Amino acid sequence: MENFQKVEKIGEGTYGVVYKARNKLTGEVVALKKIRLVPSTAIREISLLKELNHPNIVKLLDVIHTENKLYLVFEFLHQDLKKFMDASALTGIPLPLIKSYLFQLLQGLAFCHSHRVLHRDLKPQNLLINTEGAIKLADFGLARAFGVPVRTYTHEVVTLWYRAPEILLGCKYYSTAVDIWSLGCIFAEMVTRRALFPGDSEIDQLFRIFRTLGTPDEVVWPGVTSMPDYKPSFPKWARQDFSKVVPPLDEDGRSLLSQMLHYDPNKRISAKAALAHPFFQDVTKPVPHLRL
Ligand SMILES: NS(=O)(=O)c1ccc(Nc2cc(NC3CCCCC3)nc3ncnn23)cc1
Numbered sequence: 629m630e631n632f633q634k635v636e637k638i639g640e641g642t643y644g645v646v647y648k649a650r651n652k653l654t655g656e657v658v659a660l661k662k663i664r665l666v667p668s669t670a671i672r673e674i675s676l677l678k679e680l681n682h683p684n685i686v687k688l689l690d691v692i693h694t695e696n697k698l699y700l701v702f703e704f705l706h707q708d709l710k711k712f713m714d715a716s717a718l719t720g721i722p723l724p725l726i727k728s729y730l731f732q733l734l735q736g737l738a739f740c741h742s743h744r745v746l747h748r749d750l751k752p753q754n755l756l757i758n759t760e761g762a763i764k765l766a767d768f769g770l771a772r773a774f775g776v777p778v779r780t781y782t783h784e785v786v787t788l789w790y791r792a793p794e795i796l797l798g799c800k801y802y803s804t805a806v807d808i809w810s811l812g813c814i815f816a817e818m819v820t821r822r823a824l825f826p827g828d829s830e831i832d833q834l835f836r837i838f839r840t841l842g843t844p845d846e847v848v849w850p851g852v853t854s855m856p857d858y859k860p861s862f863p864k865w866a867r868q869d870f871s872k873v874v875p876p877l878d879e880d881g882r883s884l885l886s887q888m889l890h891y892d893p894n895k896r897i898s899a900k901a902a903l904a905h906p907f908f909q910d911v912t913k914p915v916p917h918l919r920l
Contacts, residue, residue, distance in 0.1 A: 629692065629699055632660050640782050641767065642749065643774055648704060658689060659705075659766075663698040663774065664781050673773040674700070680745060684736030686756060686766045705756035705764060706920050709814070712757055715919070717821055724914050726818045727881075729755075729763045731903070731911045733811055736765045738899035741804040745769050748802060749776055750810035751790050752817070761915045788833040789823050790814065793844065794893050796834045798856030805893035808902070812888030819877045835863070841889065842867030849891040880907040 632649040639646055641661060649660040674691050681687060687703040709729070713721065721729075733755065740747070747754075748771035756764045779785055788796075792809035795802065816824040825840070827833025838844070843864040844852045852858060870882045877885065884907045887897035897905070 629660075629662075629694075629697070631692075632658070632701075634660070640780055640784060642776065642780060642786065643770065644781055656689075657704045659686075659702040661700040661702065663700060665696070666693070666698050670698075670773045673769070677745075677769045677773075680740060680743060680769065682736055682739040683762070684732045684764050685740065685768055686764045702766070703764075705758055705766075707757050707918060708753050709755040709757060709763070709818075710752035712916065712918075713752060713818065713821070716917075720821050721818050721916075722914065723819075724912055725761075725916060726815070727908065727911050728761065728913050729757075729818070730811070730815055731908050732763050733765065733814075734899045734902050736768075737804070737807050737811065738903060740765075740768055741807070741899055744804075746772065746802060746804055747807050747810070748772070749786075749790075750807055750814065751787055752814060755814065757916060757918070759915070759918050759920075761913050788827045788830060789825055791827075791833060792893070793834065793837055793891060794855070796830055796837075797852070797858055800856075803893050804898070805896040808888050808896050808899060809893075812885055815881075815885055815888065816874050819874050819881070824873075838862065839865045840868055840873060841891065844891045852891070880905070880909075883907070 631652055633652055635648040635650055637645060638648050638659065644662040644664045647660045649658050650656070651658060671693060678688050678691065686705065688700065689703060690701040692699040692701065745768065747765060747768050749767070754766040756766050777786060790810035790813045792806040795806060813824045825833060825836040827836050842848070843862055846853055853860070870886060874882060874885060884902060884905045888902065890896040
């Protein structure tokens, strides 16, 4: 910790405060994350993450385990997708830039998923951008290390907006499909400039999904009626057209989004298969208009 000068609070993450900081010796600019107090399994899990290197994954530079305290040192990025989306709202992020960001996030997911590491808590706040037109996933793997809480250390409510239905229905065993669901939610949000499912409680989240995608049943999702928090008494809404859900997304994008939002996690498209979807045929890498 004391090898680092704090520059500014960037905010409060799921686990603790996050600071922009400078390495007092080398002068590296980093994101310094203090983790709420560790358990030996967390230590070993976190150490696995240090090897999990990819250009679309925010690089974990160091784990500092001293003073019976936990600090993670990450590559610093200057802006998140929430801020960029807010700043891009009058016109929306251009479609070629949305496609580039999606394509790159799918490459980051395909990499981590191939090593059997899930994120489990994707959201615009942990998708980070640079001036070179890259986008990167932050906090990959931390959920398995530390366990997603209802509120943060400072009592902020953790979003349910990107949570997959199998989590909301109480499944204990998450697959990589939960990441594809979240990213599909984020895809829809970039295109429409509104969150797809802005739930404010678990049942509101579920019922918003149900109203857009149809109440899931045994036809679309074998095994659904036997999940822990499924209730026979759930209302039965009908599905709406994607044409109505994500205008003005084109037929390729609407097709891909449908596959990312399949109820059954076993039918949901994988990151690798999604990279091959015709939506990405004409993918490019534009430079974003970034004000820092
Ligand atoms: N709000 S902002 O666009 O100015 C912004 C967003 C992210 C960062 N950087 C950042 C932020 C971050 N965590 C965010 C979690 C949600 C609260 C804000 C900090 N983790 C990071 N890892 C590497 N960089 N980095 C800096 C500015």
